[PDB]
Ligand binder design. Structure first.
Ligand SMILES: [Cl-]
Ligand SMILES: [Cl-]
Ligand SMILES: [Cl-]
Ligand SMILES: [Mg+2]
Ligand SMILES: [Mg+2]
Ligand SMILES: [Rb+]
Ligand SMILES: [Rb+]
Ligand SMILES: [Rb+]
Ligand SMILES: [Rb+]
Length: 136
RNA sequence: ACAU
DNA sequence: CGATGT
């Protein structure tokens, strides 16, 4: 109903899908960029959205912050809830890096606790998430 | 259908 | 127009 402004917003950006993948997290209230991942040569939109949420969890936990995370990705929210990224991307030499990071994000989820609410950014009502890359 |  | 996902 109402945006929770005291929150972290995350999003993926890509050049192609599958293609070059990156992600960032911003303060929802101000747009200040809080973290940005270096581009990964090949990955999918959903793998990137998943990594962005997990990185947000780790960021907030390290800073003892109870803020929720907003994501526009129904898929990535479910994958994080399940602690399992059900990606169709082939595992081969070209995709080794993205899959390493996805595997390591799952591993972190299975070995750590958090109470962070992971909320759906309601794009249809609120416009583009504040972490969007402005490429569409 | 919905979400990217 | 194409792709990734539930
Ligand atoms: Cl990552
Ligand atoms: Cl909340
Ligand atoms: Cl959701
Ligand atoms: Mg998104
Ligand atoms: Mg976006
Ligand atoms: Rb902590
Ligand atoms: Rb975009
Ligand atoms: Rb969107
Ligand atoms: Rb589809």
């Amino acid at each position: 109903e109402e945006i929770i402004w005291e929150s972290l917003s995350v999003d993926v950006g890509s050049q192609g899908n599958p293609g070059i993948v990156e992600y960032k997290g911003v303060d929802t209230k101000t747009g200040e960029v809080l973290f940005e991942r270096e581009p990964i040569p090949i990955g999918t939109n959903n793998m990137g959205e998943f990594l962005a949420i997990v990185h947000g969890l780790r960021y907030l936990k390290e800073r003892n912050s109870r803020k929720p995370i907003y994501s526009d990705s129904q898929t990535a929210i479910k994958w994080v809830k399940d602690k399992k990224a059900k990606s169709t991307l082939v595992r081969n030499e070209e995709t080794a890096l993205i899959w390493k990071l996805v595997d390591e994000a799952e591993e972190w989820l299975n070995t750590h606790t958090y109470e962070t609410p992971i909320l759906k950014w309601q794009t249809d009502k609120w416009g583009e998430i504040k972490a969007d890359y402005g490429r569409k």
